[PDB]
Amino acid sequence: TARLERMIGADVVQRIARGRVLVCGLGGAGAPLVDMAVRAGVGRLGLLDPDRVDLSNLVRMPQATLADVDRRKIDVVAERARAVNPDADLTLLAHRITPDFDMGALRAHEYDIIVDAVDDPAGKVALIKYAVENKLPLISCMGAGNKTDVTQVHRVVDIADADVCLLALETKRLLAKEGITRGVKCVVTQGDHWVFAPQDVIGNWPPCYFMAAAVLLDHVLRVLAGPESVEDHVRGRAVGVSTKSGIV
Amino acid sequence: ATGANFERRVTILGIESSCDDTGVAVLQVGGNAPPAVLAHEAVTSAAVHRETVAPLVDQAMAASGVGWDAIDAIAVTVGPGMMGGLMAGVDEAVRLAALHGKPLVPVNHLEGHALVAGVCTRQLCFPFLVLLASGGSCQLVLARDLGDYRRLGQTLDCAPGQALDAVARALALDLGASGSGGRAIELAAKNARTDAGDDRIGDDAWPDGCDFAFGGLRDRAVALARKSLAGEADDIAKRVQALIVDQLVSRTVRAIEWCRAHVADPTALVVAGGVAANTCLRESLQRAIGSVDLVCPPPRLCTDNGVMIAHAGALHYLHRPDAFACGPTHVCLQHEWHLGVDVSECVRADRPVPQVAAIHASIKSDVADAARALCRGELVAFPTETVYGLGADAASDEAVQRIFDAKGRPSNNPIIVHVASKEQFYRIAGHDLDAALRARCERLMDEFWPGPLTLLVPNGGEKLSPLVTCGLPVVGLRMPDNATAIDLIRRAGVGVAAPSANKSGRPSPTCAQHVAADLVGERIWGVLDGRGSTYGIESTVLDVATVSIYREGPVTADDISRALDGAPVDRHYAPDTDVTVVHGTLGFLNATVRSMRDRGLRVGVIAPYGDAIDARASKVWYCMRHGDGSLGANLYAALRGLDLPDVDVILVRAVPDSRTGGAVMERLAKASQGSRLIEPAMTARLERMIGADVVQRIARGRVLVCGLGGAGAPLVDMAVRAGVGRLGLLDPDRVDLSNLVRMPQATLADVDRRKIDVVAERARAVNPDADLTLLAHRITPDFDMGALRAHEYDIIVDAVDDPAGKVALIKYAVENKLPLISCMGAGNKTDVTQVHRVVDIADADVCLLALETKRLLAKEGITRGVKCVVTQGDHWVFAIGNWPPCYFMAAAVLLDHVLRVLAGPESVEDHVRGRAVGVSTKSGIVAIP
Ligand SMILES: [Mn+2]
Structure with missing residues (x-):
């Protein structure tokens, strides 16, 4: 990984490399985020998912193959990450996220940045509660299922301003019932979210999950570097800007 | 008659894998000598089991040193036990058998325990009773004959071992692991002192007897509360041990009395499991049973080790050497197999346990025995969908004449030969797929042949008895429907010529009992059990060549006329599970x-x-x-x-x-x-979101991803996973350490390998039926082959890092009116807020590489209507870096555009709007059907 160091300072490069991130719910915007992180140069990862991959999980994550069906999600994701970078520090957790288990929460506060991608809203609100109570830096992605639009993309806003997305509204209601309404960050589209018909649905327009993966990648890179406004780092490291015509 | 009374002093390799303890044995029986434990490797400490299964057998072979060729069986357990361990052991025994041509002997865990507790003991006649311990299957079985085990009783609630463990935990006197607690509890019996202590203490005892066969766990439940609060409870331990021994011996002697009353009396009292170490139980049993002798194996043969499997496999192989000949089939890995006939308290009490008359000598099941009987030419009567069959091997004149004499031979008649396979039919009719007309008979096979369909094939050779044919065309080779008949014919040879079982003037065969009565005095192998042969309405003759329908049955010519071809006229199977x-x-x-x-x-x-x-x-x-x-x-x-x-x-x-x-x-x-x-397919969620026809259209679409230095590889991943079919690549380069970030299809052990090949093999791995037509080649001036393939293909999305190749391809596409969208500027950008656009390049803002391509296209001559993906954000000069989010974002935008083009009318928007029943917009949740 040298083009990133060509872009941003090396100090930031080994700040990200000496970075620890925990990913919950590898059944959506998490596993592609895992690929992006391990290729960017991220070190410790905190994968946490008890399910096994399916063909729908095959279309979701890059770390999968028709020969990998029914294999544990964490196993496939970790082996692919190690293939990308043998020097990695992947950590298997399993640890289904029913609202009773909290040793994974012990490991969570042990970590640095917590990424939430739990497909179950109950698990999502449990993680948000735990992180808010322990003041941990948490990013709660509401996924990208049932979304269609691409002109407007996911942007990191507070849970107070969460809107439109059905999952975002459900998590907002659950958190307000629990008593927290502004502490946690979130990643929402603010775009059309079809409800479809009861058949269980899900959604999964293929570009939308990679939309979410890219946005989560960007936010994880923002928070993994020691707070410096990495835009400022590029400004002080690069030469041209090229907004209107080009500024040195 | 259980140690050794046969010739062929064989050595057997027993592998046991049912429980946590893994054991392998090389026992050797036969001749007139006691069995000898040649090697007894075992490990008690599943992934661990699958890891250890091979080292244990290898080390046992090394230690035995008898010879890997002298071993004549690979007898392995398939009986009750942990399912994963059973699969590992069986999958380790079958591997050895296939690699070395040794027959495989599946054995039962409980039968193994009984036989291993029958090992040694100088002489042990086979009419003996067993007291299987060590598990939730504390059973009383009687070994009337090898394979004729009748289960007299079974513990309804719990086993003595669980009670001993619970009492040990209540007293905290584990003192080791597993049966060590029971050993300590039995040691706690101090005779007079503990008896006086129990007399002083209150104690508790209330089994009250469970029916007549066996069973008790209420004593343990009472003992839990009795010993939870008390302290020094040596007297309580002695009391519970004595009560357990009393219950065991009482049920044992009751079973002995009942069996001696109504069946053959026992000649031993073999006790299996870990309770055999209980000295008090042994003494009480010896004092109570009387004439019958107590048999107690060493504890080394009780903790689920390979010796029992080796010995049981040895006995089974010796008893039926004809069976287990050379090939393993019917490898059934059961989790709850039981150990034979169940009688229990009431049936033991009444005494006779039903009755099977000597007239009903029908040998039910034993399909292998019937198959070998047919091979030797012995007559076998088996049920079919039609009239109850009775026949032998077709390629034997003596056998068919024996059949005729058995039924009296009123005449010869046309005699249908039952055949169950594709290969056997071809071989027996005319070989080499008969002729070119066999395309109809294969269709008949795949449509109706299992059942009452009688293909009157005109033969062609092989070997058929003159008596069975009674004509030039061979009689109507048929698949029967009764699964027993299909199994028997499959295990048989060329085929089975079974006319009927109609020795009397009025056949009325129906059930197996009636045909057995009609053939009480005969020289036949036996009669298989009837599974519903009462539907005797015959079949339909369907002469293949001149599609002529003779005497018809259930199938009827209407469905034989699926494709017309003329129909000249001159229920079904149902599994219970x-x-x-x-x-x-x-x-x-x-x-x-x-x-x-x-x-x-x-x-x-x-x-x-x-x-x-x-x-x-x-x-x-x-x-x-x-x-x-x-x-x-x-x-x-x-x-x-x-x-x-x-x-x-x-x-x-x-x-x-x-x-x-x-x-x-x-x-x-x-x-x-x-x-x-x-x-659910790989695009199952996608077909949920948009119509199945839409996803099929996307599958039929083609893509011409150019140089994959930029967003080409992620786009290929997205398209392949989304369901796209034909693709093409145009990147003749090799990956590098820096190129690793933009490739989702990359590993550290892939450097310097061809990028196009890596992407192609990953795409084929994700989708097997993915048609990839890798073009390779450089910018390729005049792109003649590239031009022809672009004509053949569909949207020609490009990510060429070289500005010249990009503009050359754009010029070709615009001059040939081909669908094109490019990406150009994707690196050196920082902000992900706006790095996504699909605009014509004439409208493109700074996106510096977009300006470069704009100038080059303007110099080329035309720039109005070619699409592109510009950032519209911040393109830092940096005196060619990249932001990892930005490349994947651009890949997502390219995927969106590709699926928009591969959708058609108004694309995914109107497709979902027609499919979805409601939209949650920026204001409210509007629902439209
Ligand atoms: Mn056992």
Whole structure:
């Protein structure tokens, strides 16, 4: 990984490399985020998912193959990450996220940045509660299922301003019932979210999950570097800007 | 008659894998000598089991040193036990057998325990009783004959071992592991002192007897509360030990009295399991039983070790040397097998236990025995869908004449030969697929042949008896429907010529009992059990060549006329168990097994030995493809062998090839109105979101991803996973350490390898039926081959880093009116807020590489209507860096555009709007049907 160091300072490069991130719910915007992180140069990862991959999980994550069906999600994701970078520090957790288990929460506060991608809203609100109570830096992605639009993309806003997305509204209601309404960050589209018909649905327009993966990648890179406004780092490291015509 | 009374002093390799303890033995029996433990390697300390199964057998072979060629069996356990351990052991025994041509002997764990506790003991006659301990199967069985075990009693609630462990925990006197607690509790009996202490203490005892056979656990439940609060409770331990011994000996002597009353009296009191170390129990049993002698094996042969499996396999192989000849088939890995006939308290009390008259000498089941009888020419009577069959091997004049004499031979008549396979029919009719007209008979096979369809094939050679034919065309070779008949014919040779069982003037065969009565005095192998042969309405003759329908039956010419071709005229099978066909991959089968087992239903899976059900299938049947695989006959055999009342459902995985299993058997099984399960496709969520026809259209689409230095590789991943079919690549370069970030299809052990090849093999791995037409080649001036393939292909999306190649391809596309969208500027950008745009390049803002391409296209001559993907954000000069989010974002935008083009009218927007029943916009949730 040298083009990133060509872009941003090396100090930031080994700040990200000496970075620890925990990913919950590898059944959506998490596993592609895992690929992006391990290729960017991220070190410790905190994968946490008890399910096994399916063909729908095959279309979701890059770390999968028709020969990998029914294999544990964490196993496939970790082996692919190690293939990308043998020097990695992947950590298997399993640890289904029913609202009773909290040793994974012990490991969570042990970590640095917590990424939430739990497909179950109950698990999502449990993680948000735990992180808010322990003041941990948490990013709660509401996924990208049932979304269609691409002109407007996911942007990191507070849970107070969460809107439109059905999952975002459900998590907002659950958190307000629990008593927290502004502490946690979130990643929402603010775009059309079809409800479809009861058949269980899900959604999964293929570009939308990679939309979410890219946005989560960007936010994880923002928070993994020691707070410096990495835009400022590029400004002080690069030469041209090229907004209107080009500024040195 | 259990140690050694046979010739052929054989050495057997026993492997046991049912419980946590893994053991392998090389026992040797035979001649007139006691068995000798040549090697007894074992490990008690599943992934660990599968890891250790091979080192243990290898080390046992090394230590034995007798010879890997002297071993004549690989006898392994398939009886009750942990399912994963059973699969590992069986999958380790079958590997050895296949690699070294040794017959495989499946044995039962309980039978193994009984026989191992029967080892040594100088002489032990076979009429002996067993007291199987060490598990939740504390059973009283009587070994009337080898394989004739009758289960007199079984513990209804709990075993003595659990009670001893619970009492030890209550007293905290574990003192080791497993039976060590029981050893300590038995040691605690101090005779007079503990008896006086118990007399002083209150104690408690209330088993009150459980029916007559056996059973008790209330004493342990009372003892839990008795010893939870008390302190020094040596007297309580002595009391519970004495009460357990009293119950055991009482039920044992009751069973002995009952069996001596109504059946053959026992000659030993073999006790298995870990309770045999109980000195008090042994003394009480010896004092109580009297004439019958108590047999107690050493504890080394009680903790589920390989010696029992070796000895049981040895006894089975010696008893029936004709069986277990050379080939393993019917490898059924059960989880709850039991040990034979059940009688229990009431049937033991009344005494006779029903009755089977000597007239009813029908040898039910034992399909292998009937198959060998047919091979030797012995007459075998088996049931079919039509009249109860009675026949022998076709390629034997003596056998068919014997059949005729058995039924009296009123005449010869046309005699139908029953055949069950594709290969046997071809071989017996005319070989080499008969002629070019065989395309109709194969269709008849795949449509109706299992059942009452009588293909009057005109023969062509092979070997047929003159008596069976009674004409120039051979009589109507037919697949029967009764699964026993299909199994017998599959295990038979060329075919089975079974006219009928009609020795009397009025046949009325119907059930197996009636035909057995009609043939009380005969020289025949036996009669198989009747499974519903009462539907004797005959079949339909369907002469293949001149499609002529002779005397007809159930099938009727209407459905034989599926494609007309003229129809000149001159119920069905039903498994008792809920058979379910699983369509998809092995992963979906394992997921279905796990999920359905978690629902409480117990499952029986039918799969070839190559497959591997995960851990949770109750009974696993391995087809063991040996000859040429199911072909229907193996599938019927497996279905019959898993029709046990225990199993709730049977899962059969229909392979996508659907070539070996060519028959209507799977079609009939899947037609049970819910028995068919289809794995959700890779685009299952996509087909949920947009119509199936839309996803099919995307699949039929083509893409011409150019140089994959930029967003080409992620785009290829997205397209392949989304369902795109034909693709093309135009990047003749090799990956590098820096290139690793932009490639999702890359590993550190891939550097300097061709990028196009890596992407192609990853795409083929994700989708097998993915048509890739790798072009390679550099910018390729004049792109003649590239131009022709662009004509053949569809949207020609490019990510060429070289500005010249990009503009050359854009010029070609605009001059030839081909659909094009580019990406150009994707690196050196920082902000992800706006790095996504689909605009014509004439409208493109700074995106510096977009300006470069703009100038070059303006110099080329035309720039109005070519699409592009510009950032519209911040393009830092940096005196060619990248932001990892930005490349994947651009890949997502390119994927969106590709699927918009590959959709058609108004694309995914109107497609979902027609499909979806409601939209949650930025204001409210509007619903439109
Ligand atoms: Mn056992």
